[PDB]
Design a binder for this molecule. Sequence first.
Ligand SMILES: Nc1ncnc2c1ncn2[C@@H]1O[C@H](COP(=O)(O)OC(=O)[C@@H](N)Cc2c[nH]c3ccccc23)[C@@H](O)[C@H]1O
Ligand SMILES: O=C(O)[C@H]1Cc2c[nH]c3cccc(c23)S1
Lengths: 333, 334
Amino acid sequence: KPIVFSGAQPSGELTIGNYMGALRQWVNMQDDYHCIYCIVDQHAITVRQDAQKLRKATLDTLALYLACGIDPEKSTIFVQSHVPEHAQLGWALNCYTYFGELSRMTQFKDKSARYAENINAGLFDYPVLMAADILLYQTNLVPVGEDQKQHLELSRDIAQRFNALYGEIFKVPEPFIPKSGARVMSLLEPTKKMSKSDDNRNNVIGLLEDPKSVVKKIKRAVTDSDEPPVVRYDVQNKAGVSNLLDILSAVTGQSIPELEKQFEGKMYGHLKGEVADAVSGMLTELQERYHRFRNDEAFLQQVMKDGAEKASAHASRTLKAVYEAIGFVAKPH
Amino acid sequence: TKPIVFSGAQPSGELTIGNYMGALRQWVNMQDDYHCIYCIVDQHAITVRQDAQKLRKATLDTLALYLACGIDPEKSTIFVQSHVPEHAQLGWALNCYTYFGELSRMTQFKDKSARYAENINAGLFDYPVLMAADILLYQTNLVPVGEDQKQHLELSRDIAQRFNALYGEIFKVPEPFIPKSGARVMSLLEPTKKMSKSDDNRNNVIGLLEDPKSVVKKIKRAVTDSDEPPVVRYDVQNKAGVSNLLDILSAVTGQSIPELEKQFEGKMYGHLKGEVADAVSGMLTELQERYHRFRNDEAFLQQVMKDGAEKASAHASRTLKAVYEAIGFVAKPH
Ligand SMILES: Nc1ncnc2c1ncn2[C@@H]1O[C@H](COP(=O)(O)OC(=O)[C@@H](N)Cc2c[nH]c3ccccc23)[C@@H](O)[C@H]1O
Ligand SMILES: O=C(O)[C@H]1Cc2c[nH]c3cccc(c23)S1
């Protein structure tokens, strides 16, 4: 049974796209793979932010993942900084990573533009820590979005390079190739995917938005001039309408041919009304689960404590072999 | 509580008399006056590719060399860097408070880049930040280092002040402790070049574990100025070889530079190199007798490492917990 590792940023404002795409897909596969979810608070601090907000967002992310169906009995979920092995292997893998490999990262060069005032060593060194995150757990599979592909490739390079010197210490991870299938596009830019990182929040529906705000953003979702207004799937002529159908279908399960006949003789106004109802209905159940988890501090502590302990048994095993291989004197027990 | 001293050396190569005069001598001298913590920085060592068996042996060699020099485990915390996870942990956190430019301007990074151009790795680049972590973890007041670590030490003051300015007095701002004499021991055949463990010309280098007979031969061959007449006078700029030899003899006898200048009045360089030779030969001979007694007792080495890591961890965890609270990490449930 393959080991899967995902990093969860304790700062991402997750959208319905995240939830009905990757998250829903992985929630349904917790018994097929040994899934590990790691809230990467050590990665987060490469971008400076309020300390209290980072603490709060670490817990928000924990409760949100739980509300989405991550089951801490089936999967391992934990906070990165709670397992010191991440930093430890992070340092040691620096010594097997070329400076040039890090310099050629587009994530570093792109994030240098956005944060030209904090081009800090953490921003530069992020891929090595990522590499350590993955390799500690003998990970077979990493779901990555497009802008993490090069980071995963470095991880595979580091694993192979390290193995070539010392033996099969790490598993070489593979990208998880199949995509969720749900199509959720930006509400004003329906050629671009709805993204949690959009600075234009009116493109997205965040997982915690209330129904009044959902209607606001859906009602302003772009449509087509087509006279008469016809609810028909056409990603090039009627993308906006096609996006609303795709989102509704992702919410309800109804097929696109079913939805077309559902809205036969209906206007663009009612289609948005049905989308908002379906989306807010979905978000209302997620939200009540979120707040039940989120307000239960003892529960969240127990999850964090149990997850870190599960992660640690694997992480320390790998780090022990790493340190033995590199040549350190073992810590006297 | 006494003010805290922290310093480290790599279990790489063979420690030199430069390592002794720039760092190790002051470490011994400070053990009573301050609370001293001394580290074998094996995680720093691996920034230069090392044979794994040699690295493990070098760690034990270095520890026995500390003990031979007079570092006393009942006065000083002595410990191996990789035995205290908090060094790696604070290293990462402080990465996020260090500017890329501060690391690319590092003289040591550039020098090691040219020398290990086949292994210009991120550890070599990130080196100063882990060093910063090594120091700041212990609320360190003083860092006894040679002159070549000054830039590294100054970055760690910058990092500490930068972090404190955001978060309160989490760290002490450390101060360098760099000796007036012997901060930059020079190469015997090229006294304009610092004496370096990695020198391929071994006639430049006095090894602390090297055969005293070979050391005497190298010191007798040390190059000296062409002053006419020869005069044994301390002048590091114009009389580099002679002054370096005066520093070295000073480090063995404890006589001041002016007492040695008065002692060598009417004496020439041949007599000088002879005295330095006999003095260093005596010191290394006694050093190596203590070295082997410590080094051949691996169970003692193991006990020192365990006691030291445990003493170090108590202090490092206390600092790391405060760092984690300040930057906003959820604390690990206990
Ligand atoms: N020719 C010389 N003359 C005088 N002093 C010299 C000479 N060559 C070396 N030194 C000093 O010896 C110490 C050990 O050298 P390292 O190369 O191990 O030094 C190094 O590699 C450090 N980065 C180890 C370290 C890691 N973390 C620390 C924290 C505090 C202090 C030191 C450290 C050093 O003090 C060095 O300045
Ligand atoms: O930015 C992101 O989402 C990445 C954050 C991250 C840190 N460590 C890992 C390991 C696997 C996958 C990811 C990460 S995804």
